[model samples]
Target: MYDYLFKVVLIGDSGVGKSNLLSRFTRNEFNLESKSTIGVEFATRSIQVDGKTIKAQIWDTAGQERYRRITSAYYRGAVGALLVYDIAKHLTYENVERWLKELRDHADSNIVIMLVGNKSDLRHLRAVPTDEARAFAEKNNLSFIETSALDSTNVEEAFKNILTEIYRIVSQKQIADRAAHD
Candidate 1:
């Protein structure tokens, strides 16, 4: 059995539930009154993918207006990212384009990005339609999913999907390199 490590960042505008998503997935903690993440914070979780242990270092970046430098620093070396936005907030969805530009500037070119619509529990208030987000993700070549940290919907699947995809890519590269050297 082998182990693979992947750095994944969760980023978006403030109050999009980035930390809640991370906490729910990593520590199984959910606080309704969760405060905004001040800077960069991370957590680790090990998952099995294709008979290998995949350790994911999930980073939650501060979504506030300032501290762009600090947030950008956390993006380097990230193999995957979760670009999150609140489904109930149209402004957050509107700013998703800006978030994509930020990721392009700081994250690796080949990083696997998933556009996440958090707070899916707020179904009645969903400002960003599910189809719209999916279409946008398809256009941008990113995976898309809607999750709810409160009720724990699709939280584990989101992480699993991204890490597994990254592992598949890495495994192929290793095989290609081995063949080239032989």
Candidate 2:
């Protein structure tokens, strides 16, 4: 029953609801007036999973192009990333690949990535097909899910899935290290 701390980042184009997602998951509060994150803002939440205390340090970064380079440095040591995009915005989905490139450039080679399509409640306006997004995730070897922070749908599961995946991978590596030493 050891404690583990993991760093995760929420990244995507501006107005893709990254802040709202972070707020909803960390604080259980969603702000309709949520403004774009400035450079980088972080929040922490502790959860119990597999009998271990997992502390998630979530960093929400500004998605504007000007801040891209600054946020690139934020990827150091990140174990996971939620690459969020607006379900109703096609451009946001189109930019997912660029974000993936950024992640590859800055994040750890083994960082777990989740392709998140936000604002699922906007089904009527959905421009990015779920199947397409899922296929893209598969092609890139990323986990995939849809979430709506406004309605609080799948928000908890999104965070839990990513964190638990990181925990499992890290724990497995620890076990392997001990076996090698033994």
Candidate 3:
């Protein structure tokens, strides 16, 4: 019955399938022709991890560069972020560094970030190298994974893994806080 809650965000350039990714994660269904996210849309789900009822507040954002002005609004009090990119689209992959810089400029310093390379099913058209992404993630200290929202590949696992990792970190912080008072 633990009531812990953490905020999460999906960020990337416009038309990289951010909305489809969100739908796949929250509803377990992906809409091939899903309309682009406008401004911001949010969804919440409860996860039972290690017998604790933790709630994840996931936010979907418009990826237009202009939306960057309001991106900070979503970062407020957020505990983790998912910097989603498209593997088949080189531009999207190249923007990862910009996304990371954006997170660093606005999010909590310790906020857990997962560098998600979406569209894994489109490997035939992939423009980003898996090893290149892995190396980038390692150098930047971010969790890395490539997922396919269309075939529902790694959708649940990615969300669960990141949420579980953040939970562990937050739970440790809570324990440390309690120890300080003892």
Candidate 4:
């Protein structure tokens, strides 16, 4: 009966609802009146799966400097990440690959990744297909989910799913390491 501490990153373009996902999961309605994140902001949320609590320390940085080289320090200890994009903006969706490469270059090799299609409530405004995202997820081997912070749909599951996945992988890996102590 042990608790796991995991670092999860929330990343993607500014308009993609990263802040929304962050707030909706940790607090509530995010920064509605402009002025995005305060450098790198993080909140810890604990969720239990299989009778063990997994503490997810989620990070959401300022969107303004997204194009600049993000700090290498941020990717260290990152066990899980939600690579999000706006469903209404095809350009944001197109940029997922860049973010993937960014992760590969920075984070650990076995980092758990989830592709989140945000702005799901935007029916008419939707530019990226749900099926398209799923297909991409399949190609990249990333877990997939759609969320709408406005409607607060699937936001909880996205965080829960990634933390659970990190717990599943890390715990087993730890067990394996113990076995190596032969």
> Best candidate, TM-score-wise?
2
What is the full ranking by lDDT, best candidate first? 2, 1, 4, 3
**How well is each residue in 1-182 modelled by candidate 1, as lDDT tens digits?**
33988999998899999999999999988999988886689999999999889999999967766655545579988999999999999998898998889888888889999989999999999999999999999999999999999999999999999898889988899899999999
lDDT of 2 by residue, 1-182 (tens): 33998999998999999999999999999998988787688998888889899999999877877735644579888999999999999999999999999898889999999999999999999999999999999999999999999999999999999999999999999999999999
Overall local distance difference test of candidate 3: 0.85
Q: Quote each prediction's TM-score.
A: 0.94, 0.95, 0.94, 0.93
The clash numbers for all candidates, in the given order, read 0, 0, 0, 0
Q: Candidates 1 and 3: which is better by lDDT?
A: 1
TM-score, prediction 3: 0.94
Summing lDDT over every window of 10 consecutive residues in candidate 3, give the lowest-scoring window. Answer: 63-72
Clashes of 1: 0
Highest-lDDT candidate: 2
Worst 10 residues of 4 by lDDT: 62-71
Q: In model 3, what lDDT does residue 116 have?
A: 87
